[PDB]
Amino acid sequence: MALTVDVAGPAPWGFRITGGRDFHTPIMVTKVAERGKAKDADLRPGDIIVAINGESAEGMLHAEAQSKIRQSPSPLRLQLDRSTIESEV
Template structure:
């Protein structure tokens, strides 16, 4: 049995390292067994970790860590990348996939860059959650029924949050 796999001839290792998992890798991977395509790097963001450590659009991903990528569907490949933590090892085959070049001056398009932040709660004070709205409406109805009962309970200072 030959321990050397010919499909890995001409491949090279690329290792990406980051300080924390809040720092994005800076590349977009496409393909997978479920998409009838090999896994490949479709885009590498400028000034990203992916670019700094040598990933290029068109690189085919042959291994993620010690896992052969040729039999992974897209979601399984993403799971392997997540499992890698802050040190990601790829075995790649350079220029294996023809990736269309992006227009350097896109017209009418913008790119959304993911920025990890701590969730600080609802920042728009005019927006209410559905559950808060339901509770408020129920309380307003109960207050209205108390006023109609003439129960001697004063509700003149009640505030409805709508």
């Protein structure tokens, strides 16, 4: 599922990221702090960050994506890919 999340600021945003071009992996949210701005914003552990403030995250180094997020104006605009689930009942 593709989605666009706007996170109210300013930093600290209250989430964690993994990955980047130097690890040859995508930028992914791994944790959202229970008391924090990302919790309000509808951001979920496991969301892949496709774009940061309209700029593609594809070729960003870990530290590069980290820095762009921390330096970001409010709101932080993330383009996301989210893994949906289906349960049998």
